[PDB]
């Protein structure tokens, strides 16, 4: 199809240039072929035409043409058409490594392409030669920025009159004593990476050696229409146009995020899951399916507004085809029950949402990424979402691990002196798991920072492929029952692989929700599960306090900032319930809130502060000087004030001074 | 220029790959709901007057200040605002350096076949000195 | 301080040498192990060498009498490892141009001279054959054979090509295996280029009936590989 | 090194022998200039102008009074009758403090003075208002005064001042002929002495005469070695057996081969060197050599040339006779054709902003690959014309190197151009009617076979120039 | 000249440097050889 849609693309050239004559030019571009009767056939190009190789290349995959392609093409046919080898180049990672084997494999010759590797002998290099001038081999020896310039004149010596012989087209020539008959088809290539990094610089007459040939783009869209094609339906070609078009404007559109990505193997994937889906669906239904695969992406990666600007730019595509919908109201509802009352957790709909995005995206691909603060609901979320799994489900067996919180080395083994090979950690839990039972399925949870060495250290599993490698040559696959969960908080130093690898979930700070907690935590402590608790001690009074005090105080410090320290609001209702326990032991609530708010606050701006909220409180301040006094009774119900002491064998020793009950 | 594809298409309530930005040196249109009157371009390469594309020399500067542009948009290939032969690409650069890859190649007429054209090299730059 | 300095010298000098006559007694016994051609061929150091092992693992044991260093150290004289020394550099000189003969050709010289005497060692086995076969050739694995020789599946014959792909292609030619191991290898090597040639043809003669038979719908593009129905289907758009 | 410099001070004395109390300004009347000139063959213009300035005020940095290399270096309407970018120049000159005192001390307001000083070519010689000088710029800051006002005589004023206002015993500042033997009479025979191989050099012609001339002794013992492959083992002999008896050697090709000289360096510094024992050194300008040859060696250099005359010229140079004298007239025609065009492209990388977004590395392998693709384009018989092989010829010698779509629009417009191909002097095939063409080619380039303007190439060059300044070169 | 100069080597070790009027001595030597060697026989011997 590959090459089908591309005589398609010529013709239409022909078609619209109306092209008139037969030896058209345009046309002479491309390949000729004829047979014979001979032994041997024939090839045949805009110039050059020489025997066939009959050589058994071996179905494989196979690259997409592009007018740097047909560039390239030309380059060498003519290189080869002169009798002098080629050096195109430019950029690293264009695509190049591929086109070189590529291009020597579409007429099936050897491509041996090799690194310039330690320090190259120059006796390497010749019987490398020696064995391929005979044996009539191709190739090329990338890297060769790295070569010692001793081997590069050795070697672009042999190059050259190795090259005046076969001009000559001799039939034998000797080279250190090497008389030796030649073989005629012999091609050398050569592709180095320009000035990027220090690197051993180009011989002149050895640059003038060659010629080069800079390149710089390649492509999709092939794979994914012929996919498309290859699932089951046919009208595929626009709709992958559309997908490409989509999927350009995106990055070019979304706004340039870290974590923003559409990593090839994910796009990939999407594919062949939309490709699976289609099964036991109409022919209408697939169209639906496409944007609501798309959406199964949009979900969970887009901030809103940016999902309200690409939702609308999908829907000018489709604009009649808006109203899918998932269905999942019994897991929906399992997990509402489990959240409600199984766990005596406070639950939420909101919060069962985010649980129903997990519970797809693991279903969708063994490992995601989750952005929050710890016990901030989204640990809880995942609790609820195992619990809710063994409630659907026989168990789950699970493990919990830190990558920072000791090194790597003993993380995945290394030898004691002695020789003596030591094991690592993820190596006994995975033994473990595949060794218990069939009867759960197993999953760990990763917490903590973002450091490039360790999660490179495992990608053997973050591809495609679930499977291990280990120093003490052991290697470890794994059946899908084996799923890992990656907790963040900041990808300050993540890499765009590490991205491209697993899939991605946002949570917005704000989503946390507030009051349903902190009534829960007003109502009813957490259930006892474990053994051996704290102890913990209308309620409607203080919560309308709290409510009323809320807005107000925080407009009252916004303008105020001011904190010495950045903090959250959750620790300070944290810092609340002790303020209701020292009440067990509204106006104490008042003063302990006052207490947990104005720690961070600054001296100048203790005139700011506290002063705002004395006009703010409902409780007149009679300490109009420094209103900080305040120890209020319970017994008595006095108002405030405060106490010292100080003696001698308070300061006996050196140490141990008696700094008075200062205030 | 993005998000006036994004403006114009939910106004009309048309696909974004569809619409075509097309420039209009003189005025705006309305099946593009709205022409941008935008300021800080100038040629480079060709002189110009009223409906005439000039070619520069040697005592005129290489710079020539556009007149007063607006710019429309379109459904994908339906009759735009000048006819392709008519209209010829010229490249658009960042600025006053040449540097960085063109972001895209603008429409302009050509008095004679391209050839001409090309040979001059023309372009335009977003903003000098 | 004297006469354990002394004492050091020597026996560092000592087991320096031991060590390097030991290593490369290793090298010539493992080599000559891997195969008894190579000392058939190669009599005389061969020869020179078995008796190298045999006093050396005399000596070996005389020095294993006296194990503990600290009074077993005490070995002086031990320079005969230089003759030792000389005799090996004189031996592996020659086997390395005998090394040169067996390897004389050009495509021996795209695999390792180690690997090119496990060949030396066992090149006429069929499964060793097939397994350096895909080691050494870029799109190419095995064949199958003959599973009885009366005992065995051993060297017989290739019936059928399997490539990296497995594709599975049966031989036209049946080629049989001998003992003449670059002959009857170059002999494949035409196997594989004129095999692919008639395969080529009579693809290109039933593409051709394709051609003809292209208005009912044909299966028989599908019917042939992918490589050679693309290529011929190529030509038929360069006639169009 | 100071050994050769303390020898060439010798011959300053020794090419004197003038009998008189006249030698000692004698004697150092050549030692300025023999230690001067075993300088300009080594620097670039640029390390030259700093070094005259340094031994300039080194002799006997006094008018620069407030920094004025600065925004001499960079770092309007009053007036009609000039242009505006005079004005924006003049308003660089009036920048919020930089010259305004001495812009004002111009007395432009007054246009009679300045505008008939900048309607004048060569306002200095000839007139150049006496009067408006002494008001303004009298020694030095009236190249601060060209800076703006008429930047048309840059260079001239500067080297017409900085001879002038020196006492330099220069009379003229460059040297005689390019005679090499009388610079290789005070040559030792054991310090080396490198070639750098400019563009179109190759002094090696002349180190044979010499050998043949002057050393009759030894010419053909001697010799020279391309550095090659093991011409270690060969040359080093070749070497050492040379210094056991003093021969002669000349090294090419070092360029290419850095990484033997380490050891080549090692073994010759390893030993001292015999009497007679001259060597010789070539390469090209590279780096990645071992600086221990680079700065105890002699640095000799040419003059590279340019032009679609002088390309064509080099061009029909390697093409051989045989192949300048192909079988018919129609193949050299188109192939005169063809190299006219690939001249032009070459000849354009001269421009770096506009000719090409940037200069790509085109070659003379790339006039090589026009050549046997064409011999392959020939080698049947069948009326080849050339929509095609202008795609590959463009497709190759340069789709490799125009990959930017702007590159490639003016490469086919081009391949259009030359070769019409698109429906919308000449000679017969012997060479000499090429080198006939050679000279109807005007030597002098017009922008018309270009198709570009005039005056930004003055612009590149004056700014290549500002990048020399700068590379020369609690405050502001 | 002052590569590495810091008071601490200044203080625990001696410093010696010379910085023009040695090299001129050398050129009259070499000069008074070259103007004359009944001037350099002169003057090397008698000191």
């Given at each position: 199809i590959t090459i089908d849609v591309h005589s398609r693309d010529v013709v239409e050239k022909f078609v619209i240039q109306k092209v008139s004559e037969a030896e058209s030019f345009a046309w002479l571009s491309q390949l000729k072929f004829y047979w014979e009767n001979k032994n041997k056939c024939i090839i045949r190009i805009v110039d050059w035409f020489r025997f066939y190789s009959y050589e058994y290349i071996g179905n494989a995959i196979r690259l997409v043409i592009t007018p740097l392609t047909d560039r390239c093409y030309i380059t060498l046919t003519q290189a080869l058409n002169l009798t002098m080898g080629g050096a195109p180049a430019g950029p690293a990672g264009t695509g190049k490594t591929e086109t070189t084997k590529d291009l020597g494999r579409a007429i099936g010759i050897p491509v041996m392409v090799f690194n310039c590797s330690d320090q190259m002998n120059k006796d390497s290099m010749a019987q490398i030669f020696m064995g391929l001038s005979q044996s009539g081999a191709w190739g090329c020896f990338d890297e060769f920025n790295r070569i010692s310039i001793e081997v590069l004149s050795v070697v672009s010596t042999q190059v050259k009159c190795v090259l005046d012989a076969l001009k000559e087209k001799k039939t034998k020539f000797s080279f250190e004593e090497g008389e030796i008959q030649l073989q005629d088809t012999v091609g050398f290539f050569i592709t180095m990476n320009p000035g990027y990094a220090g690197r051993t610089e180009l011989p002149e007459n050895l640059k003038a050696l060659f010629r080069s040939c800079a390149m710089?783009?390649?492509?999709?869209?092939?794979?994914?229409?012929?996919?498309?094609?290859?699932?089951?339906?046919?009208?595929?070609?626009?709709?992958?146009?559309?997908?490409?078009?989509?999927?350009?404007?995106?990055?070019?559109?979304?706004?340039?995020?870290?974590?923003?990505?559409?990593?090839?193997?994910?796009?990939?994937?999407?594919?062949?899951?939309?490709?699976?889906?289609?099964?036991?669906?109409?022919?209408?239904?697939?169209?639906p399916l496409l944007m609501r695969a798309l959406r199964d992406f949009n979900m969970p990666k887009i901030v809103t507004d940016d999902k309200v600007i690409f939702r609308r730019l999908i829907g000018d595509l489709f604009p009649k085809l808006d109203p899918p919908t998932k269905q999942n109201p019994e897991l929906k509802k399992i997990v509402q029950d489990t959240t409600k009352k199984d766990m005596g957790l406070v639950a939420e709909e909101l919060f069962v949402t985010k649980v129903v995005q997990l519970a797809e995206i693991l279903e969708v691909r063994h490992c995601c990424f989750v952005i929050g603060p710890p016990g901030s609901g989204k640990t809880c979320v995942w609790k609820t979402l195992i619990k809710s799994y063994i409630n659907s489900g026989e168990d789950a067996e699970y493990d919990t691990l830190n990558p920072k919180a000791v090194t790597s080395d003993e993380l995945f083994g290394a030898y004691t002196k002695t020789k003596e090979w030591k094991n690592g950690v993820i190596a006994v839990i995975m033994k473990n798991q595949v060794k218990k039972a069939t009867h759960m399925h197993k999953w760990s949870v990763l917490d903590g920072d973002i450091d490039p060495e360790w999660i490179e250290s495992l990608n053997t599993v973050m591809d495609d492929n679930k499977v291990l490698t280990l120093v003490s040559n052991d290697r470890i696959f794994l059946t899908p029952q084996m799923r890992l969960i990656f907790e963040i908080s900041n990808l300050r130093n993540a890499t765009p692989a590490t991205v491209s690898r697993a899939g991605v979930l946002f949570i917005n700070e704000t989503d946390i929700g507030?009051?349903?907690?902190?009534?829960?935590?007003?109502?009813?402590?957490?259930?006892?599960?474990?053994?051996?608790?704290?102890?913990?001690?209308?309620?409607?009074?203080?919560?309308?306090?709290?409510?009323?005090?809320?807005?107000?105080?925080?407009?009252?410090?916004?303008?105020?900032?001011?904190?010495?320290?950045?903090?959250?609001?959750?620790?300070?209702?944290?810092?609340?319930?002790?303020?209701?326990?020292?009440?067990?032991?509204?106006?104490?609530?008042?003063?302990?809130?006052?207490?947990?708010?104005?720690?961070?606050?600054?001296?100048?701006?203790?005139?700011?502060?506290?002063?705002?909220?004395?006009?703010?409180?409902?409780?007149?301040?009679?300490?109009?000087?420094?209103?900080?006094?305040?120890?209020?009774?319970?017994?008595?119900?006095?108002?405030?004030?405060?106490?010292?002491?100080?003696?001698?064998?308070?300061?006996?020793?050196?140490?141990?001074?008696i700094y008075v009950a200062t205030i | 220029l993005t998000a006036i594809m994004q403006v114009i298409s939910r106004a009309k309530a048309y696909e974004l790959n569809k619409l075509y930005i097309q420039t209009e040196i003189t005025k705006r249109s309305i099946a593009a709901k709205e022409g941008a009157y935008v300021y800080g371009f100038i040629l480079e390469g060709a002189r110009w007057d009223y409906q005439l594309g000039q070619l520069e020399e040697s005592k005129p500067k290489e710079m020539f200040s556009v007149l007063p542009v607006t710019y429309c948009k379109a459904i994908p290939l339906?009759?735009?605002?000048?006819?392709?032969?008519?209209?010829?690409?010229?490249?658009?650069?960042?600025?006053?350096?040449?540097?960085?890859?063109?972001?895209?190649?603008?429409?302009?007429?050509?008095?004679?076949?391209?050839?001409?054209?090309?040979?001059?090299?023309?372009?335009i730059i977003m903003d000098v000195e | 301080v004297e006469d354990w300095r002394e004492k050091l010298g020597r026996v560092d000098v000592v087991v320096n040498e031991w060590l390097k006559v030991q290593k490369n007694w290793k090298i010539l016994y493992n080599i000559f192990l891997l195969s008894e051609d190579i000392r058939m061929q190669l009599p005389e150091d061969t020869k020179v060498f078995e008796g190298v092992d045999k006093e050396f693992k005399d000596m070996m044991s005389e020095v294993s009498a006296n194990p503990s260093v600290v009074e077993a150290c005490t070995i002086e004289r031990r320079d005969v490892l230089v003759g030792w020394s000389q005799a090996i550099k004189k031996c592996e000189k020659a086997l390395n141009d005998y090394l040169e003969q067996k390897k004389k050709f050009p495509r021996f010289y795209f695999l390792s001279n180690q690997s090119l005497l496990t060949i030396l060692s066992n090149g006429q086995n069929?499964?060793?054959?097939?397994?350096?076969?895909?080691?050494?050739?870029?799109?190419?694995?095995?064949?199958?054979?003959?599973?009885?020789?009366?005992?065995?599946?051993?060297?017989?014959?290739?019936?059928?090509?399997?490539?990296?792909?497995?594709?599975?292609?049966?031989?036209?030619?049946?080629?049989?295996?001998?003992?003449?191991?670059?002959?009857?290898?170059?002999?494949?090597?035409?196997?594989?280029?004129?095999?692919?040639?008639?395969?080529?043809?009579?693809?290109?003669?039933?593409?051709?009936?394709?051609?003809?038979?292209?208005?009912?719908?044909?299966?028989?593009?599908?019917?042939?590989?992918?490589?050679?129905?693309?290529?011929?289907?190529?030509?038929?758009?360069?006639?169009? | 090194s100071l050994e050769s410099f303390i020898t060439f001070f010798f011959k300053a004395i020794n090419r004197t022998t003038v009998r008189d109390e006249n030698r000692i300004p004698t004697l150092i009347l050549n030692i300025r200039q023999t230690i001067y000139q075993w300088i300009s063959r080594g620097l670039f213009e640029k390390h030259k102008l700093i070094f005259l300035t340094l031994i300039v005020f080194r002799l006997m940095d006094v008018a620069y009074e407030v920094a004025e290399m600065d925004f001499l270096i960079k770092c309007e309407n009053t007036l009609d009758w000039l242009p505006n970018i005079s004005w924006d120049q003049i308003q660089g000159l009036i920048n919020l403090e930089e010259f305004r005192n001495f812009a004002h001390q111009l007395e432009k307001e007054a246009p009679n003075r300045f505008k008939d000083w900048y309607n004048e070519l060569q306002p200095e010689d000839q007139k150049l208002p006496l009067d408006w000088k002494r008001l303004d710029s009298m020694p030095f800051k009236k190249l601060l005064v060209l800076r703006c006002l008429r930047p048309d005589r840059m260079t001239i004023s500067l080297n017409n001042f900085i001879r002038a206002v020196l006492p330099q015993g220069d009379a003229f500042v460059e040297m005689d002929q390019k005679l090499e033997s009388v610079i290789n009479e005070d040559s030792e025979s054991t310090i080396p002495i490198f070639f750098i191989?400019?563009?179109?050099?190759?002094?090696?012609?002349?180190?044979?005469?010499?050998?043949?001339?002057?050393?009759?002794?030894?010419?053909?013992?001697?010799?020279?070695?391309?550095?090659?492959?093991?011409?270690?083992?060969?040359?080093?002999?070749?070497?050492?057996?040379?210094?056991?008896?003093?021969?002669?050697?000349?090294?090419?090709?070092?360029?290419?081969?850095?990484?033997?000289?380490?050891?080549?360096?090692?073994?010759?510094?390893?030993?001292?060197?015999?009497?007679?024992?001259?060597?010789?050194?070539?390469?090209?300008?590279?780096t990645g050599i071992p600086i221990g040859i680079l700065d105890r060696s002699i640095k000799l250099t040419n003059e590279p040339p340019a032009g679609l005359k002088a390309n064509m010229k080099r061009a029909w140079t390697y093409f051989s006779?045989?192949?300048?004298?192909?079988?018919?007239?129609?193949?050299?025609?188109?192939?005169?054709?063809?190299?006219?065009?690939?001249?032009?492209?070459?000849?354009?990388?001269?421009?770096?902003?506009?000719?090409?977004?940037?200069?790509?590395?085109?070659?003379?392998?790339?006039?090589?690959?026009?050549?046997?693709?064409?011999?392959?384009?020939?080698?049947?018989?069948?009326?080849?014309?050339?929509?095609?092989?202008?795609?590959?010829?463009?497709?190759?010698?340069?789709?490799?190197?125009?990959?930017?779509?702007?590159?490639?629009?003016?490469?086919?417009?081009?391949?259009?151009?030359?070769?019409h191909e698109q429906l919308f002097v000449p000679g017969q095939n012997p060479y000499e009617k090429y080198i006939e063409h050679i000279e109807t080619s005007l030597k002098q380039e017009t922008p018309l076979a270009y198709g570009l303007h005039p005056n930004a190439e003055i612009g590149f060059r004056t700014d290549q120039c500002k990048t020399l300044f700068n590379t020369l070169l609690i405050k502001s | 000249i002052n590569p590495h100069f810091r008071p601490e080597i200044a203080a625990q070790c001696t410093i010696i440097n010379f910085i023009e009027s040695g090299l001129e001595e050398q050129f009259i030597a070499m000069v008074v050889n070259i103007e004359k060697n009944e001037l350099e026989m002169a003057k090397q011997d008698l000191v």
């Open positions: 710089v783009v390649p492509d999709l869209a092939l794979i994914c229409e012929n996919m498309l094609m290859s699932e089951g339906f046919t009208m595929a070609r626009v709709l992958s146009r559309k997908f490409v078009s989509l999927y350009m404007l995106s990055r070019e559109l979304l706004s340039k995020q870290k974590h923003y990505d559409w990593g090839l193997r994910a796009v990939k994937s999407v594919l062949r899951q939309a490709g699976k889906l289609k099964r036991g669906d109409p022919d209408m239904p697939e169209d507030w009051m349903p907690y902190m009534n829960s935590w007003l109502e009813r402590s957490q259930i006892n599960i474990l053994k051996q608790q704290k102890e913990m001690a209308a309620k409607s009074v203080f919560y309308r306090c709290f409510q009323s005090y809320f807005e107000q105080n925080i407009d009252v410090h916004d303008k105020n900032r001011c904190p010495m320290v950045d903090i959250a609001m959750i620790q300070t209702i944290c810092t609340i319930l002790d303020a209701l326990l020292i009440q067990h032991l509204e106006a104490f609530f008042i003063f302990a809130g006052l207490w947990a708010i104005g720690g961070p606050v600054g001296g100048g701006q203790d005139d700011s502060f506290n002063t705002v909220w004395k006009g703010a409180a409902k409780v007149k301040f009679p300490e109009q000087g420094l209103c900080y006094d305040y120890y209020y009774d319970i017994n008595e119900n006095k108002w405030n004030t405060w106490k010292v002491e100080d003696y001698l064998p308070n300061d006996q020793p050196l140490f141990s001074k | 339906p009759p735009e605002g000048k006819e392709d032969k008519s209209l010829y690409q010229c490249p658009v650069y960042k600025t006053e350096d040449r540097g960085n890859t063109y972001v895209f190649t603008a429409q302009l007429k050509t008095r004679f076949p391209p050839r001409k054209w090309i040979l001059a090299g023309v372009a | 069929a499964p060793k054959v097939c397994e350096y076969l895909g080691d050494c050739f870029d799109g190419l694995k095995t064949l199958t054979f003959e599973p009885p020789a009366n005992p065995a599946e051993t060297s017989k014959v290739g019936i059928g090509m399997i490539s990296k792909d497995d594709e599975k292609v049966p031989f036209s030619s049946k080629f049989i295996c001998e003992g003449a191991v670059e002959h009857w290898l170059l002999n494949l090597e035409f196997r594989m280029r004129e095999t692919l040639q008639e395969i080529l043809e009579g693809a290109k003669n039933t593409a051709d009936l394709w051609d003809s038979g292209d208005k009912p719908r044909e299966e028989w593009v599908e019917g042939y590989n992918a490589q050679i129905a693309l290529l011929t289907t190529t030509i038929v758009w360069t006639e169009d | 191989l400019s563009p179109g050099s190759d002094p090696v012609k002349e180190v044979e005469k010499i050998a043949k001339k002057k050393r009759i002794e030894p010419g053909k013992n001697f010799f020279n070695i391309a550095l090659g492959q093991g011409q270690d083992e060969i040359a080093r002999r070749r070497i050492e057996e040379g210094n056991k008896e003093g021969h002669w050697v000349m090294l090419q090709n070092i360029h290419l081969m850095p990484t033997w000289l380490i050891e080549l360096e090692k073994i010759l510094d390893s030993y001292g060197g015999n009497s007679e024992f001259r060597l010789f050194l070539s390469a090209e300008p590279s006779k045989e192949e300048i004298e192909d079988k018919d007239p129609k193949i050299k025609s188109i192939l005169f054709a063809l190299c006219f065009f690939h001249s032009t492209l070459i000849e354009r990388r001269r421009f770096g902003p506009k000719g090409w977004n940037m200069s790509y590395p085109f070659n003379m392998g790339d006039l090589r690959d026009s050549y046997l693709v064409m011999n392959r384009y020939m080698e049947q018989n069948q009326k080849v014309p050339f929509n095609d092989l202008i795609y590959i010829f463009g497709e190759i010698m340069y789709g490799g190197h125009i990959v930017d779509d702007w590159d490639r629009r003016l490469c086919n417009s081009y391949l259009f151009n030359t070769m | -």
